[PDB]
Design a protein around this ligand. Structure first.
Ligand code: HEM
Ligand code: HEM
Ligand code: FMX
Lengths: 89, 109, 377, 53, 47
């Protein structure tokens, strides 16, 4: 959480990054979303939220894999796919 | 030390060309040299190929192994045509055999 | 956690999980794991049969019937054993054929170990079959044992030695029980050594061309391919056990002991037929047994007779025809080995015997040489 | 000295795995019961009364 | 001679019935996992 707070604030430092943020936020969210709202969102996150939210997008999900280079040892897709779930769970 | 052509040579060629088609490695896109049994003389010949040939053979072999697993073959339009079949490994292999044979003749004295 | 570091799972991982294997190995490659399943099968059922069988001349035939009638489910265990022995040979045959056709024998050590594994299981099955002390068990035991008597100078001290007497009697049934119990454990060790030498290079494939550019992990792929194929081995085994228990089993072993009376037409088990025909062909004591030994011991000469510039027979029309002529010839030997030594049969049996050797020692190697020339190699 | 595993994080870890450990026992119980045909335990399941009385 | 005769064929029934369930299923498990290889596509793109 703290890492996100520092990142959020560290980023919006100076006219250019803030401008880019105003400009594109309006494109995406439609509004600006003031620091404080982000803060409340972040505050709401606890272990449970991480577990659930992660499970939803990650758990037993088919990934997209891209590889370039000396990739003979890159695991087979089935093998990568089996790493997306845990047999003890 | 030359002149001749023969209707017979064509029959011999026709028999070779016949067997080549019967062998069928050309249905997998392979070329003759791709199918040679890698012994030491051969591994060294593979080793001496220039990048382009070395890489082409790798891709052809992969293409064939992949066909073999699906027990499929290439469209007839893509089979390797006898007589468009390049003896790319031969000269390296012959040379590696010559040098070995030389080593052997030296080991005799 | 990790499969790779633990001194033990590291072996497992390197043998069944991460072992790089050819993307293209065929059904023909399933037999090695089926041979392993066979060995384990024989081991488990074998064992439970040992908890109830007795090795004395008197009660031997009887204890086996005790198993089939009295002991809970002994019949199913007994039939799985018997039919498992046949499957084991079915698998040996395919496995050895696969190696010939595809040039796999070029892995010298692992192929040589295979031959040893072949002789070991044949030794094992022989001792096994004698165990119930039936008519064929006895006479088969008498025939095979006497082969050793052909050996010059020391021939007879040897058979009597292996007998522990003046003929197949008491002493032999007991020792055969013993050797038949230990052999499969010794086989198991040789098989691990077989698998060790094989991993040194990994598997060959249908094309006879290196697959290092297209290796896949043994695990998800061959793990499931092997499972599926085990279930097929099982169906075929059960069909026998559960629908045709006596089909390969000779009716004469259902009659006890007769050292005094040899059955009219004694017939080998099945997997010995072709070799039995070869031994019989030639009307000579020594030469028959020599031909017999050579008929199997020939596998180890195979590698010296490789003549082709290619490994597999996949791109070799001539060799292919001769290969099947070999198979067709073996099938002829099988038919002939199960038939009376008479008119049409002895001549057919002698010509098939020269053909077997003629094609391995001369025909195949000559085909390889002309296939090379045809290709301008 | 097992006090290395005594603290808040370990207690949260213990919690997150309770349902899993619970459900594993479920699997083990039902599985032991069904493999030995636990006369005692089974006689209570509605169907699976293939022991009449 | 063969007291087990009737139990054997009842088992035998079950063996074909079970085998007829498992065979298609295990076969489908293997195809699923082999999907990835069977439909994979290759392309060579040398300099
Ligand atoms: C675990 C090691 C083994 C043990 C302890 C074992 C035990 C036995 C016993 C006690 C018998 C006599 C009872 C009967 O005939 O049914 C027997 C017979 C036999 N076993 Fe084994 N055996 C073992 C490995 C093998 C192997 C490797 C083979 C070869 C595949 C084999 C094939 C046979 C055969 C053919 C018979 C004669 C079967 C018959 O028709 O009755 N067994 N075995
Ligand atoms: C107890 C008997 C045997 C066992 C347990 C056994 C087990 C195996 C296993 C697990 C493989 C790995 C892959 C495959 O399925 O092909 C294999 C491959 C091989 N075995 Fe055996 N086998 C036995 C008998 C033989 C015999 C009789 C021979 C030849 C006389 C033989 C020579 C080979 C060879 C040459 C390969 C090379 C693989 C290939 O080229 O595809 N083995 N065996
Ligand atoms: C099962 C059998 C047997 C087992 C293993 C054998 O080993 C070989 C198999 C093939 C090739 C060489 C040996 C041979 C016979 O044991 C046995 O008593 N017989 N019966 C028999 C009948 C007539 C002549 C000789 C033998 C077998 O078939």
């Amino acid at each position: 959480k703290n890492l996100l707070r520092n990142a959020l604030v560290s980023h919006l430092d100076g006219t250019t990054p803030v401008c880019e943020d105003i400009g594109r936020s309006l494109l995406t969210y439609g509004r600006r979303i003031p620091l404080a709202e982000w803060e409340s969102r972040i505050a709401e996150v606890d272990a449970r939220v991480v577990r659930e939210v992660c499970s939803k997008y990650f758990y037993d999900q088919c990934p997209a894999v891209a590889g370039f280079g000396p990739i003979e040892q890159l695991p087979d897709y089935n093998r990568i796919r089996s790493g997306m779930f845990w047999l003890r769970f | 030390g030359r002149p001749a052509v023969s209707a017979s040579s064509r029959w011999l060629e026709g028999i070779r060309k016949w067997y080549y088609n019967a062998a069928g490695f050309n249905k997998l896109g392979l070329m003759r040299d791709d199918t040679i049994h890698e012994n030491d003389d051969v591994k060294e010949a593979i080793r001496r190929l220039p990048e382009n040939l070395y890489d082409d053979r790798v891709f052809r072999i992969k293409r064939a192994l992949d066909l073999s697993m699906r027990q499929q073959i290439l469209p007839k339009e893509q089979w390797t045509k006898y007589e468009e079949d390049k003896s790319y490994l031969e000269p390296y292999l012959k040379e590696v055999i010559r040098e070995r044979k030389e080593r052997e003749e030296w080991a005799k004295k | 956690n990790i499969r790779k570091s633990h001194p033990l799972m590291k072996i497992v991982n390197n043998a069944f999980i991460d072992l790089p294997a050819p993307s293209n190995i065929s059904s023909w490659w399933n037999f090695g794991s089926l041979l392993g399943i066979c060995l384990i099968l024989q081991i488990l059922t074998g064992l439970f049969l040992a908890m109830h069988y007795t090795s004395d001349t008197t009660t031997a035939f009887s204890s086996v019937t005790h198993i089939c009638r009295d002991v809970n489910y002994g019949w199913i265990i007994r039939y799985m054993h018997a039919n498992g022995a046949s499957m084991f040979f079915i698998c040996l045959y395919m496995h050895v054929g696969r190696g010939l056709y595809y040039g796999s024998y070029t892995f010298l050590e692992t192929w040589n170990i295979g031959v040893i594994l072949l002789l070991t299981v044949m030794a094992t099955a022989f001792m096994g079959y004698v165990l119930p002390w039936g008519q064929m068990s006895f006479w088969g035991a008498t025939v095979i044992t006497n082969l050793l008597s052909a050996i010059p100078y020391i021939g007879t001290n040897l058979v009597e030695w292996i007998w522990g007497g003046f003929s197949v009697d008491k002493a032999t049934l007991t020792r055969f029980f013993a050797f038949h119990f230990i052999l499969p454990f010794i086989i198991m060790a040789i098989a691990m050594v077989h698998l060790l030498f094989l991993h040194e290079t990994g598997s060959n494939n249908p094309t006879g061309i290196s697959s290092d550019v297209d290796k896949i992990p043994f695990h998800p792929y061959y793990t499931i391919k092997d499972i599926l194929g085990a279930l097929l081995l099982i169906l075929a085994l059960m069909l026998l056990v559960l629908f045709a228990p006596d089909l390969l089993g000779d009716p004469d072993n259902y009659t006890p002991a007769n050292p005094l009376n040899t059955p009219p037409h004694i017939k080998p088990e099945w997997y010995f037929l072709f070799a039995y025909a070869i031994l019989r062909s030639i009307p000579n004591k020594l030469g028959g047994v020599l031909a017999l030994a050579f008929s199997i011991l020939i596998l180890a000469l195979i590698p010296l007779l490789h003549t082709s510039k290619q490994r597999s027979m996949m791109f070799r029309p001539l060799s292919q025809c001769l290969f099947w002529a070999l198979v067709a010839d073996l099938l002829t030997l099988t038919w002939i080995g199960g038939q009376p030594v008479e008119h049409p049969y002895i001549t057919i049996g002698q010509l098939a015997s020269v053909l077997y050797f003629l094609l391995i020692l001369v025909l195949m190697p000559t085909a390889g040489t002309i296939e090379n020339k045809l290709l301008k190699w | 000295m097992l006090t290395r595993f005594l603290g808040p994080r370990y207690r949260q870890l213990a919690r997150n795995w309770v349902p899993t450990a619970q459900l594993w026992g479920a699997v083990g119980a039902v599985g032991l019961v069904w493999a030995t045909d636990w006369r005692l335990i089974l006689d209570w399941v509605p169907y699976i009364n293939g022991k009449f009385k | 001679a063969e007291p087990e005769h009737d139990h054997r064929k009842r088992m035998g029934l079950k063996m074909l019935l079970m085998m007829g369930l498992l065979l298609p299923l295990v076969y489908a498990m293997k195809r699923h996992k082999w999907s990835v290889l069977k439909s994979r596509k290759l392309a060579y793109r040398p300099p």
